[PDB]
Design a protein around this nucleic acid. Sequence first.
DNA 1: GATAGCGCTATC
DNA 2: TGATAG
DNA 3: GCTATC
Length: 327
Amino acid sequence: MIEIKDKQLTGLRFIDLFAGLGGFRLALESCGAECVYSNEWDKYAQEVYEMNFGEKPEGDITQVNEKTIPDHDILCAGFPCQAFSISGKQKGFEDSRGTLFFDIARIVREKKPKVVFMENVKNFASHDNGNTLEVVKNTMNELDYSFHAKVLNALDYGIPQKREAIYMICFRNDLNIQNFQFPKPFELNTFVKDLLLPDSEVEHLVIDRKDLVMTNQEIEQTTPKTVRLGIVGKGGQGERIYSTRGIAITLSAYGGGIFAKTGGYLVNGKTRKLHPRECARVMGYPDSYKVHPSTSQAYKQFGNSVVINVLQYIAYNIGSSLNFKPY
DNA sequence: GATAGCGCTATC
DNA sequence: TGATAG
DNA sequence: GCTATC
Ligand SMILES: Nc1ncnc2c1ncn2[C@@H]1O[C@H](CSCC[C@H](N)C(=O)O)[C@@H](O)[C@H]1O
Ligand SMILES: *OC[C@H]1O[C@@H](n2ccc(N)nc2=O)C[C@@H]1O
């Protein structure tokens, strides 16, 4: 992740809903905020959270009495996105994992925090003819908050990963916050090969499919895009090899394919998926972060996590706005 | 749970 | 008649 | 992401 000398969010307290690995925790904390509550019902995500924050999140948010949630300035929430993803059934709100946002709303209505910082997949912005995004928007205003949503790509904030996401920032009206802005993009100068480990430590990840099919020659220069080199199987998800000379694809939490969740990369002429540590780096996570012992769960967690760096930039702007108080 | 072929969508 | 990524 | 396999 990036370093932020002056911490705008100093003095402000936040909530880590749908905690997961604690992406919003790492993002916010760096800006000076204090986390006063986290929630996560998955046994394994719970584990890693405790391995890194010495704490265990509260289970099922759908059963927590909002009156229980601690008072706070910023409510962070990257609720479930398997229902609006371009890779699923897209039943959205008509899905068991499709609601959850109404729990976010249920909590704001009772806690009225200065800011609501949310996150979800890019498709969420167009899902159901933009009507489902409109519902989040209308819901928020009803509660008396402005609404700033926007889809960003990590390949624009120094992270070599084609990971897109919708980011929705909400300010309370009584605060008349009018100068909020999303972080400006900038040239990427880090690529997949720059985050890899010594092939010595990942020889167990190597795979050799006699049905491997190269479809393009290795590139010379690096690029802020994903360059495919080959295909295995029918080339479906998890069956596509990319160059470490370009950037990394989206890391998925439930993706299948032989190169399940991370995708395939041609490393030293060796075909293989990424190591958990590498996924961490790809998500802008510090090496000091301890990954879950179960790798399947680890890929799964980084799979549906958030990129630290982008959150940091956004958190910074949230403070710069909250901190602009002229007479 | 962990593994993997898949099979349909969105954007172009 | 195509092509790639989720 | 879904889902059948073990
Ligand atoms: N009812 C519920 N209560 C608590 N957590 C829930 C939940 N339903 C889904 N979740 C959790 O929602 C999370 C969405 S993933 C969000 C990622 C997270 N902000 C990060 O930085 O990693 C998952 O970890 C899932 O287990
Ligand atoms: O692109 C959808 C696919 O990737 C995972 N994911 C991607 C991007 C964001 N913002 N969140 C995610 O969880 C989920 C899905 O499996």
